[PDB]
Design a protein around this nucleic acid. Structure first.
Lengths: 118, 103, 132
DNA sequence: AGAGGATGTGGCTTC
DNA sequence: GAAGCCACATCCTCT
């Protein structure tokens, strides 16, 4: 699919919706692609937060690297980001030492999520 | 809007509804002797004509996590309030049972 | 490209880093859905393993920390003597192509404290070399 | 019978 | 009024 640059010059990731319902499976499987060379079997973890929620509850925020690709199986966001506010992803590729890449204003999570006018 | 548990409680405190829903005499445990009738009134109270027990029980199951009502394992249509009804109602199960003359 | 060319610069210029250079308030992000008791035993024992999850409350930026040298529980990295209860941890990492060292303390009871990010002179240099 | 996942819907509140 | 938070209401798959 289509990738996007992260705050780290060594990693990229799939595109996440701007708005989504909490605990709802994402429209497209999240992925973390490593520019450089990363040992297969390397762990990749993801976290999120902001000024309203210092650490959002996530689901299945762990994946192993395989051919420079860490395919997250059904990653969901349970914590909400707040009216208008958005989450700042913190991707972490566990190597020696650990390499971490963020991504600001990545996704906004709410209770209803995208809803058509009423 | 009135919530399902509040509505059920409303029925359990009305002697007239005892024929289709009542206390089992064990704390705040109650059973719906006529789930279809309870469902009918629930849907009527909520203005959801197509409401049935099937759907109503799903609402009850959502209470399991919120620790408001739990299921009595093994007893058909028997549930139990696990919140603090004594503090809300102001009466203990024993008294309320007597007041409603639960035989 | 595991690091950015202007490694020394990026850290001293980019807002992201500058905002996390002062003694920003930090907190334990682990198991926020469990009893405080459990979050204490967990946060501690895990620290003895040289790892923990901390996030800068203010900015909300989370981080997975691993208290070990750029390569067996360490000693200087995960300090537990510098003060009764308080715990002074330390962990290096490459944050957005910039070698840095995380540092701060946490109340072994309250599960929060302060911390910051200080550039990593050596690691930066070494890295810039391996990348040529 | 009954547990629980997925997702839409109308009430009410806050920005 | 839009955008959020809630409590279901519906539908369904499994055991």
């Amino acid at each position: 699919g289509e990738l996007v640059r992260t705050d780290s010059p060594n990693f990229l990731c799939s595109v996440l919706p701007t708005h989504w319902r909490c605990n709802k499976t994402l429209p497209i499987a999240f992925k973390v692609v490593a520019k450089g060379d990363v040992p297969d079997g390397t762990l990749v973890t993801v976290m999120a937060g902001n000024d309203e929620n210092y650490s959002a509850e996530l689901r299945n925020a762990t994946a192993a690297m395989k051919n420079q690709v860490a395919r997250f199986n059904d990653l969901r966001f349970v914590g909400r980001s707040g009216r208008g506010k958005s989450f700042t992803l913190t991707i972490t590729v566990f190597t020696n030492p650990p390499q971490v890449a963020t991504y600001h204003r990545a996704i906004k999570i709410t209770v209803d999520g995208p809803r058509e006018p009423r | 809007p009135i919530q399902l548990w509040q509505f059920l409680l409303e029925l359990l405190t009305d002697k007239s509804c005892q024929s289709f829903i009542s206390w089992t005499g064990d704390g705040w445990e109650f059973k719906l002797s006529d789930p279809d009738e309870v469902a009918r009134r629930w849907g009527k109270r909520k203005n959801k004509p197509k409401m049935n027990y099937e759907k109503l029980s799903r609402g009850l199951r959502y209470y399991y996590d919120k620790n408001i009502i739990h299921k009595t394992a093994g007893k058909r249509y028997v549930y139990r309030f696990v919140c603090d009804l004594q503090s809300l109602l102001g009466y203990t199960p024993e008294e309320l049972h007597a007041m409603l003359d639960v035989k | 490209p595991r690091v950015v060319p202007d490694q020394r610069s990026k850290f001293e210029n980019e807002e992201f880093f500058r905002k996390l250079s002062r003694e920003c308030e930090i907190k334990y992000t682990g198991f926020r859905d469990r009893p405080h008791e459990e979050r204490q035993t967990r946060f501690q024992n895990a620290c003895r393993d040289g790892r923990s999850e901390i996030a800068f409350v203010a900015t909300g930026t989370n981080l997975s920390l691993q208290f070990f040298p750029a390569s067996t529980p360490s000693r200087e990295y995960v300090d537990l003597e510098r003060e009764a209860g308080k715990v002074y941890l330390k962990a290096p990492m490459i944050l957005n192509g910039v070698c840095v060292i995380w540092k701060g303390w946490i109340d072994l009871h309250r599960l929060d404290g302060m911390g910051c990010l200080e550039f990593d002179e050596e690691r930066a240099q070494q890295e810039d070399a391996l990348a040529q």
